[PDB]
Amino acid sequence: PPLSQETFSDLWKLLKKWKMRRNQFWVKVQRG
Numbered sequence: 001p002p003l004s005q006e007t008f009s010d011l012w013k014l015l016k017k018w019k020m021r022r023n024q025f026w027v028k029v030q031r032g
Contacts, residue, residue, distance in 0.1 A: 004012055012019075021027060 001008075003009075021030065
């Protein structure tokens, strides 16, 4: 479910590598 603090937040950190700037409008719109 939707929630991130001192637990469920420890995860989501996984989608990062896939949730990074890899969105739609901001997908490769900056150096790095």
